[PDB]
Amino acid sequence: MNKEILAVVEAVSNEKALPREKIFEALESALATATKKKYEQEIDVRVQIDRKSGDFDTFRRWLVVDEVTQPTKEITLEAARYEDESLNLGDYVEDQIESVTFDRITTQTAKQVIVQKVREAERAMVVDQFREHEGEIITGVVKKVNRDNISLDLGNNAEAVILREDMLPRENFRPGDRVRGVLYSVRPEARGAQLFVTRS
Amino acid sequence: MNLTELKNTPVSELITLGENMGLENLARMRKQDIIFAILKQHAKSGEDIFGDGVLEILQDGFGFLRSADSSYLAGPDDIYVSPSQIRRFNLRTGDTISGKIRPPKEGERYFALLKVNEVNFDKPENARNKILFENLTPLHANSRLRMEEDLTARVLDLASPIGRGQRGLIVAPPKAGKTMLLQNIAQSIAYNHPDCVLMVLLIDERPEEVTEMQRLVKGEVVASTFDEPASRHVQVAEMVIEKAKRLVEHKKDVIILLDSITRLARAYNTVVPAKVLTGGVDANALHRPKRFFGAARNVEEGGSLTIIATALIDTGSKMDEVIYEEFKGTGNMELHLSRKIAEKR
Amino acid sequence: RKQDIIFAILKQHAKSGEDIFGDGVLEILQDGFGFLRSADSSYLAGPDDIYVSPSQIRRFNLRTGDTISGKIRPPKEGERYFALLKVNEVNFDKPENARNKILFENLTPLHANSRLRMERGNGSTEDLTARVLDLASPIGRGQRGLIVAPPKAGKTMLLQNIAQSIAYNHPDCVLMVLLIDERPEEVTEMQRLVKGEVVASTFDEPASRHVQVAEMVIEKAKRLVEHKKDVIILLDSITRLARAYNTVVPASGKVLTGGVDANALHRPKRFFGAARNVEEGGSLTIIATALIDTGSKMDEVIYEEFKGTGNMELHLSRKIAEKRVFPAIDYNRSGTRKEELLTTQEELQKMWILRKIIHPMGEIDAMEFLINKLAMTKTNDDFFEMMK
Amino acid sequence: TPEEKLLRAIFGEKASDVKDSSLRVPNGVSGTVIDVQVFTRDGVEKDKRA
RNA sequence: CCGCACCUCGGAGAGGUA
């Protein structure tokens, strides 16, 4: 049994930073990223471990598709024929499990992923506190000007974004300008949700 | 297009309607998912969607419109109530809100409220300007609620006459006739006074007795069997008392037929954070049910709140005896039943 | 834009030969020279700051915090700041009076002697907060207390009431409300509400400016105390200031429980303990608001460390605040040490009797009793006379 | 952040900004290793090869 | 990671090769 990661997931957790599930998700995502950066021409490798005593196993997966794009991570429907073609397009999980490769140097990016997910959890806590103390017009500072989206800043490890369709068509913003906007909903964006703000 | 109307339709008609609308196979699907898909497809057409439910404001600020047919249980089809609308319309727990709702967008799980059409079965202009329940002057029972299967009601009327705003305690040992007496009381309330809001609040009871009581009396029966935790019992009790207070503020005669003197007390004692008294009851565990009981009162400006509870003594636990002895000093009506007469049928 | 216009106007005026006047608080740098920061910019480094030569600093023994007002000149070819030619007024006084002064480090501290009564006396319903504060924890000159309260307890309203009562009863005291790492709208609201000086440093800038503004404020307060002034600082940032110091402190390898550095609490504890009552003249009162139950153990450790420092704690109850009962003060947890030096014998006996009667009752019950007893009259004297 | 070094001190897992500075063989030259010497400063603990 | 205990990638010098 891997007592090293077990002591970490048992001790560091339970302090509102690790909910016993996001910590395991971050650890398996970091292991997957390490295995991806280890191979040269083999991308999109995943790993799932959701048990204390149970060790982790690296099962490289392919993308089920009827085309030949990305020949390094694509598989055909004849491999799903064993399941009577039940594997619909858009879902990619099936393959034989291969040899796992654990190492102490792989913890470098693992710690980075862990602290990034802790920062994301702290951002979620700040969002919860904002919702607890919402109901007033706020001001924010823009950071970047992307396509059909801007950003807001309130320096308490918080952040907000405004959709361009909700803003004025004539007004274009620039970093350093204060923006007045009331937030109404938070959609679950990938790699962490973000508070969406609307003016119209 | 109403939420409760679709939730009351049978499964066969919903599956048929969904197959006619041309959606995914609804035979191997839950009824809630069927209703959700039907509402989504109907909103995509352009028609409006309406809903209703009792408001339950969460700690984060927002609230949900709990449905009555689900015994005030958090469901996937709850109507999300933004804190902005709560601050605008001065919404509180118990305010039944009915208005135009919309299916949740991509990434959401609750229906959003756009415009409220009716507040507590009345115009919103009459609800925004109202007198709080704490300001209403309490008074003793003035109007007589005559209960005159009728033999039990006659004996109850001859022993302790119950009126509007009464606060009684039906004290009886186990196997003394509490079930039949409660059934007779509910039938008499539904028959003599159909205008009153009869709510048979059951907590930690048998599911067969619950479904027998609900499909027998002519009214609303919100219950919570033993399969649910004590937190849900406390939440249902709070929702019931808040709805009753709001209806009394709207000049309604509510009758909380409570049968959870011991069950709700044990629930509060289990959910209260850790002062040890006799029987294992915390010092701050009986305050919430004490206020729940004392909420019943007669209002001179309009409306009344009557709560007729049933006590449980001689249950083998001194905790129940202490709870009964504490709650006896709060009310003003005790109807004791004899076990010797009940055992002789 | 206004600064450049003023710069050009001063240049054009100096070209004619007239004199130019300036003012500002001195900030001596580590290299030996310093600049005269402006008050309207919350002591922020500006392009038009007045340069101070080390020669004048040695001549007048100037230090950080000394208010300097005198003749300035525009910069010449190769300069970027206003040179100070002759100083006219030092700390709102003549230099001959400021040269014979006693340093703040040599002043003998003492306990609170003078009574700073917070009661308004107008019989307003807002005066109930000040009345409860005076009945629970009397505040004197040189007091070093802490306002312990969880979030959403009523710190803003209580602070506003304290500031208004100070401006009403004691208009001679210099009130300075330093708000660090707060919202700009709250800063604007406070500045346009209280009758005094309001310096702030919002979160829009890093903690370096926070530390710099805190140092400038404490140095100005020390200089005013040296000039026999009664300075009162209401810093509701002590927790934020401790977080800033822990963030800007170099790593030493000894981190306490909760992410607190071993040498991070030195500067905020010194800032807190700087408050003291001077026997030779003047005093310094610092009323800070600590944050507890904020979900971070760092704030809990900071509160537990600062608890053993002050001599006054004003605990606020979350339940009473949620019940919308203001002021939501935990009367049982509040108190002041050496209170006999600020109250008479009969007043101390009445407070002791009131505490002995209130202690058995619960928090909400005691608050309701106190409110019902204070609503019967306008002044606390009638309440004291009726209690007997 | 001083919190990450506490975690690094909690578990034996290595975590640092590793840069490669190993002694490599110059180009062209080759041969067979015939002797290896290791000199360690006083106080520092020896390693397996040493 | 806060407390064990069940009643209703350089400069100088020396030597050498053509």
From Swiss-Prot, chain A:
The gene is nusA. This is Transcription termination/antitermination protein NusA. Induction: In response to low temperature. Negatively autoregulated. Induced by cold shock (42 to 15 degrees Celsius) (at protein level). The N-terminal region interacts with RNAP. The central region is composed of 3 RNA binding domains, S1, KH 1 and KH 2. The C-terminal region contains 2 acidic repeats, AR1 and AR2, which bind to protein N from phage lambda during antitermination. AR2 interacts with SuhB and RNAP alpha subunit C-terminal domain (rpoA); AR2 cannot bind to both simultaneously. SuhB, NusG and the alpha-CTD of RNAP all interact with the AR2 domain and can displace the AR2 domain from the SSK domain (S1, KH1 and KH2) of NusA. Disruption phenotype: Mutants are sensitive to DNA-damaging agents. It is found in: Cytoplasm. Monomer. Binds directly to the core enzyme of the DNA-dependent RNA polymerase (RNAP). Interacts with nascent RNA. Interacts with the termination Rho factor. Interacts with the phage lambda N protein. Interacts with SuhB via the AR2 domain, crystallizes as a 2:1 SuhB:NusA heterotrimer. The rRNA transcription and antitermination complex (rrnTAC) consists of RNAP, NusA, NusB, NusE (rpsJ), NusG, SubB, ribosomal protein S4, DNA and precursor rRNA; S4 is more flexible than other subunits. NusG and the alpha-CTD of RNAP interact with the AR2 domain. Disulfide bonds: none annotated. Transmembrane segments: none annotated. The chain holds residues 1 to 200 of 495 of the full protein.
Swiss-Prot record, chain B:
Residues 48-123 form the Rho RNA-BD domain. Residues 61-66, 78-80, 108-110 are annotated as: RNA-binding 1. GO terms for cellular component: cytosol; membrane. Changing K175Q: Partial loss of ATPase, helicase and termination activity. Keywords: ATP-binding, Helicase, Hydrolase, Nucleotide-binding, RNA-binding, Transcription, Transcription regulation, Transcription termination. Coiled coil: none annotated. Changing F64 to L/A: Defective for RNA-binding. One of its GO terms (biological process) is DNA-templated transcription termination. ATPase activity is inhibited by bicyclomycin and dihydrobicyclomycin. Its EC number is 3.6.4.-. The keyword Manganese does not apply. Homohexamer. The homohexamer assembles into an open ring structure. Each subunit has two RNA-binding sites, one at the surface of the hexameric ring, and one at the center of the open ring structure, where RNA helicase activity is thought to take place. This is Transcription termination factor Rho. The lineage of its organism: Bacteria, Pseudomonadati, Pseudomonadota, Gammaproteobacteria, Enterobacterales.
From Swiss-Prot, chain D:
It comes from Escherichia coli (strain K12). This is DNA-directed RNA polymerase subunit beta. Co-administration of salinamide and rifampicin or salinamide and myxopyronin suppresses the emergence of resistance to both antibiotics. DNA-dependent RNA polymerase (RNAP) catalyzes the transcription of DNA into RNA using the four ribonucleoside triphosphates as substrates. The RNAP catalytic core consists of 2 alpha, 1 beta, 1 beta' and 1 omega subunit. When a sigma factor is associated with the core the holoenzyme is formed, which can initiate transcription. The rRNA transcription and antitermination complex (rrnTAC) consists of RNAP, NusA, NusB, NusE (rpsJ), NusG, SubB, ribosomal protein S4, DNA and precursor rRNA; S4 is more flexible than other subunits. In pull-down experiments interacts with CedA. The chain holds residues 896 to 945 of 1342 of the full protein. Belongs to the RNA polymerase beta chain family. It comes from the Bacteria. The gene is rpoB. Acetylated on several lysine residues in the presence of glucose.
